[PDB]
Design a protein around this ligand. Structure first.
Ligand code: TT3
Ligand code: TT3
Ligand code: CA
Ligand code: CA
Lengths: 204, 204
């Protein structure tokens, strides 16, 4: 009885791992495609499946961080959303923290996404008229020429600035979508998606 | 692009179907074993996966009803839980409604579980001192000798009665566990559990 129970629990852990990779792939595709409601529903499923996983491999931790990063980016303009125990941390700041924790290459794209998130973390506060919060986010992030231009913009209390039109929220989203395309390619061959794709192809 | 999108959506539907069967099996096992926290976490995952499924086969509807039935039975003593749009319906009444909707054989076990749920739907109200609610549940359920004994018990306003000790909440749970054992046997061979069990066995 106990031997059977143990084998069943190990099989549930294997299946949970396969579901996590499949849900990450689906969440990435919904983000890339701009399918907002599919992203919301897939995120709910990913969160629930994660709470049923205990021990994680390095690969599983990376997959969970990708899901959490895209969720924060999707909520980047939702300044009322609290992703950290410290209630002061804004969604784009929480995304920046995960971006710097992921075991991944720090290539030119990595640094461009990092810097776009830093700029937009301040811009979203400015656009809402949250000038004091924009200064507080600046202090937490920055923690020379890039930094000084941002402080000057914050000090001018201007809800819109041409610098934010050049390094825009849309530009940040497009660069992140380029990275998501790489994750989609990498995870397309995981077990559950491969098996489901083989079934759909067999019926055509 | 649209052809690829369509094939991807069909593969996601196949994978969702496999996840639903696996989560039903896991929910059944946690119920049978009395693993309350595993049941709670698995139920959260099942609910989320169900919201991402649109069209359902008759087999998938039956699987969803089994999950919903066990969730109501697990909440049978939680009189503050509202499972229906009509806020008056108690959890055991909602379980009885699903039990009568499932496409399944109406064998002797089916009728014994049905009658135990009817008795306990009144008993749980009585045990809480909700005498008027017990009479209202009685009217909705009943909807001759079994019925008349129940009305007599309700009219006596006795928080405990020997009739409820004979056809007890524990007796109802044990009969339902006998049925769950049949569902476990039937669903053990579904795709995801079979594949995960093969992986665990291969490593032994
Ligand atoms: C701090 N919290 C509650 C979160 O990170 C919720 O977001 C998540 C969590 C996991 C997967 C996912 F796709 C999204
Ligand atoms: C009326 N509501 C919200 C429900 O029935 C929730 O319960 C559920 C639903 C689906 C699967 C499950 F395992 C449990
Ligand atoms: Ca806020
Ligand atoms: Ca109530």
């Amino acid at each position: 009885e106990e031997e059977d129970a143990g084998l069943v629990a190990e099989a549930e852990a294997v299946a949970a791992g396969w579901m996590l990779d499949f849900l990450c792939l689906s969440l990435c595709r919904a983000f890339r495609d701009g399918r907002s409601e599919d992203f919301r529903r897939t995120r709910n499923s990913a969160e629930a499946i994660i709470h049923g996983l205990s021990s994680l491999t390095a690969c599983q931790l990376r997959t969970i961080y990708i899901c959490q990063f895209l969720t924060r980016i999707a909520a980047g303009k939702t300044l009322d959303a609290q992703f950290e125990n410290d209630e002061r941390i804004t969604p784009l700041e929480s995304a920046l923290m995960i971006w710097g924790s992921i075991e991944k290459e720090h290539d030119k794209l990595h640094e461009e996404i990092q810097n776009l998130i830093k700029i937009q973390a301040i811009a979203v506060c400015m656009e809402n008229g949250n000038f004091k919060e924009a200064e507080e986010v600046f202090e937490r992030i920055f923690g020379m020429p890039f930094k000084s231009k941002l402080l000057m913009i914050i000090s001018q209390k201007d809800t819109f600035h041409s610098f934010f039109q050049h390094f825009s929220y849309n530009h940040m989203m497009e660069k992140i979508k380029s990275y998501v395309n790489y994750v989609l390619s990498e995870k397309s061959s995981t077990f559950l998606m491969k098996a489901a794709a083989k079934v759909v192809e067999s019926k055509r």
